[PDB]
Design a protein around this ligand. Structure first.
Ligand SMILES: O=C1C=C(O)CCN1Cc1ccc(Cl)cc1-c1ccccc1
Length: 135
């Protein structure tokens, strides 16, 4: 059967970025790591096996990999080495990824728009948009 996650499965590559440095400053990321991470052009591979979704990111900055079930909280080590409690849910056809640590929170939304996968990262008043195309 078909699922709302179907539209996300596959391999994706970063094509544009807006406000990422501001977002990283909200996370408390330092000057040198902002420079290095901001240069990266990540590729992401999204796949599904039964109820388990896997989101694997490979880049010249860091490589990350999470596997999860919608709605079930998990431990995640972010690219910038935060140790966070994460939950990913569907809100309609949008994957909503909330990361919580030290009393703080950031939300990452992934949506399909035209032939793109658009990742929005929000921390306090800062919104970053990261557009990916199929690789
Ligand atoms: O997974 C992603 C994918 C993006 O397009 C933007 C950011 N991150 C996570 C992330 C958070 C904080 C920091 Cl400092 C860096 C990243 C990042 C950047 C480039 C490659 C991989 C991860």
């Amino acid at each position: 059967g078909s699922h709302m996650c179907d539209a996300f499965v596959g391999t994706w590559k970063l094509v544009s970025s807006e406000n990422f440095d501001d977002y990283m400053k909200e996370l408390g990321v330092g000057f040198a790591t902002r420079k290095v991470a901001g240069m990266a052009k990540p590729n992401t591979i999204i796949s599904v096996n039964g109820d388990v979704i896997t989101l694997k990111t490979e880049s010249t900055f860091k490589n990350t990999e999470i596997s999860f079930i919608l709605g079930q909280e998990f431990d995640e080590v972010t690219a910038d080495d935060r140790k966070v409690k994460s939950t990913i849910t569907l809100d309609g056809g949008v994957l909503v990824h909330v990361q919580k640590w030290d009393g703080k929170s950031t939300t990452l939304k992934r949506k399909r728009e035209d032939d793109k996968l658009v990742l929005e990262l929000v921390m306090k008043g800062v919104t970053c948009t990261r557009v990916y195309e199929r690789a």
